[PDB]
Amino acid sequence: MSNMEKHLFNLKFAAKELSRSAKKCDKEEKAEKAKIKKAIQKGNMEVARIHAENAIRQKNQAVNFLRMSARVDAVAARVQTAVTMGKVTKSMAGVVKSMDATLKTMNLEKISALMDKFEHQFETLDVQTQQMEDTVSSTTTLTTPQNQVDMLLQEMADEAGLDLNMELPQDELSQRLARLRDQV
Amino acid sequence: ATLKTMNLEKISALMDKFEHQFETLDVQTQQMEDTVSSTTTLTTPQNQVD
Amino acid sequence: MLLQEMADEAGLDLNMELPQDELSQRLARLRDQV
Amino acid sequence: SGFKAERLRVNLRLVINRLKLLEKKKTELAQKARKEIADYLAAGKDERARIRVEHIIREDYLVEAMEILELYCDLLLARFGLIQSMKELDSGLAESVSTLIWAAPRLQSEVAELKIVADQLCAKYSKEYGKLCRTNQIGTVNDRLMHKLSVEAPPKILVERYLIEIAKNYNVPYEPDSVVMAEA
Known part of the structure; x- marks a missing residue:
């Protein structure tokens, strides 16, 4: 694993850890709201207030965790690009040098020769x-x-209903150009 | 480090060669x-063929 | 040429064919001015 | 001399690609920044909105300057034959070459390659001409670009007009400074 891939993995993990932290705050803010209800019904107004403060504090913590998660993701998305376009650039640098070697030891003149010989x-x-x-x-x-052979071909042609004579032996632009060559 | 050993001039060259x-x-x-x-x-x- | 080649591979812009503080220069000027 | 034609050619291409990205990126960041101005106006924090608008005006001018330098790089690429042919500076290239030399120490923070372009042009022509360019003693640098990369604060009438138009677009109440609007 490359040194950037280690960082990419750590950022992707941190984005999830933050997203989980936000979900956990939503879960607990829902739970504290249930406790306010119970405390109000029992007239425990000091306990009602303690849960109210918890509920509002986890509502707002969630938003912070969620926003940081978004930022760390955006970074990770961009380090991903760097990791990928690193690999692509190194592959293309490799291609360029292996083709440079081959085009030396088989240059176009040497290919021309080989083809003519072939x-x-x-x-x-x-x-x-x-x-x-x-x-x-x-x-x-x-x-x-x-x-x-001539008689067998004629016999098979007769059975096929073909009028082509098989004993005897069996374009214009070429003939025109031929005449031109002689005429000049 | 990577942007030193493969700077944009060196990339330009590589791409033209490619x-x-x-x-x-x-x-x-x-x-x-x-x-x-x-x-x-x-x-x-x-x-x-024609 | 070898230094330039190694500098090119290192991505360093320093020219290797060519040759490669202020208080000293201030005091030098003072010495001549008096 | 130290002039290498293929260094100049490669770096001119790199400068164009980098400027084309920065134009896009800085245009998008201005969209995000104009909403922030509307937020200050909605909050009635108009005096800070003025100072935040000066940032937007400077980045807008910068994007217009980048568009000019990208044009002069593409002109030197289009007439690159003349560069590597003559030893004298052609009069059609004078604006382009002097401007690129003048701009380089301003822009070299963002566009690192533009340092190299100016170095090569100061190698091809004289180091002395390279100094007359940086001071515009050469009397040839493009004026409209020098205006756009000036360090001076915007005219306060422009700042007010920016706020007025941003206020309209985001449907936010704004009343401009009468002391400034009297200077219109």
């Missing part, structure tokens, strides 16, 4: 899979003759 | 996102 190596691994796929295609060339 | 470093980490994610976009350019043709 992309170029995946271009390679695409050239590689292409030539594996063409090695398998030619190795198994007798197992899948072209004409049998 | 902000500038997050501007950097946004330039960084932008260029990672453009590296992935161009690396996978054949998997998402523009006309098929």
Whole structure:
């Protein structure tokens, strides 16, 4: 527990202790009022007065305790802010230094390099899979003759009611720009 | 004590640094996102998305 | 520079590059004035 | 010289933030204080109400002075390029720079950063100019601000007029001093 958190806890406790003290005065002021009534009925006017003074003294003590409780709470609410924004400020100071380290050892130039390399190596691994796929295609060339695939596609297209010819092979802005390149 | 070892000038500095470093980490994610976009350019043709 | 660095971390505004009572000065003036 | 542009820039920002809080706080404390004047008037304690009003007039003038210094800080921030560019004082900054130097020894109790701002301006320009400012031998400090941070007692006709208007707002009977109101 931080040294301010110890103070915060003590202030919050003191605010409650005062609030309890005010409630206890309300309880006892109600009790003394009952004793005035009894003393008046018995004609004990000296005792009636003693209880009257108690009742008025606890009525007013309550208000004092209640007002101090309010003040100590307001303070505690403000020390709470300091405790919280302390923690937030220290966390953000931590973030700033750990990001400062990482942005040194991986600067944007080094990231640019890494990204370009990443992309170029995946271009390679695409050239590689292409030539594996063409090695398998030619190795198994007798197992899948072209004409049998073309005829099966046409048969399945006929059953699907699709007019697209499967034996035969199967935008404008690109063509416009192409013409421009040649025309200049 | 705390307001000595973290005065408002030192806080001002820290805050400016904090902000500038997050501007950097946004330039960084932008260029990672453009590296992935161009690396996978054949998997998402523009006309098929449109 | 080390003193300034340690002063910055301590939150102390005293400049460490630069160099860092009245009765004495009054009596000094008296000596010259007579 | 000892002038550091980023010390001046950081502290000008701090001064603005602190003045913006003090304006708000001192405006709210004047609301609370004007009710206290009405309480003295209700109690018929008019001679003390006069002296309590002088406190309110001074804090009201102070808030108006803070609004002027916050404007001159924001002007130096707006034209900060000229400060760090030239070695001569630009005529557009003369009022702002001289006023901030003049005000600093008055306000430095409340606005600690304003001491630092004046130190930096007295480093950028000459220490000699820094003395001509503090005495307004430079003949350039803003007059309306010098009036508002004067140490003299308010005109007694202003005190009466304050009481009259506070009396109206809180619906409290007040009769002003005829000897003073004759000077209107």
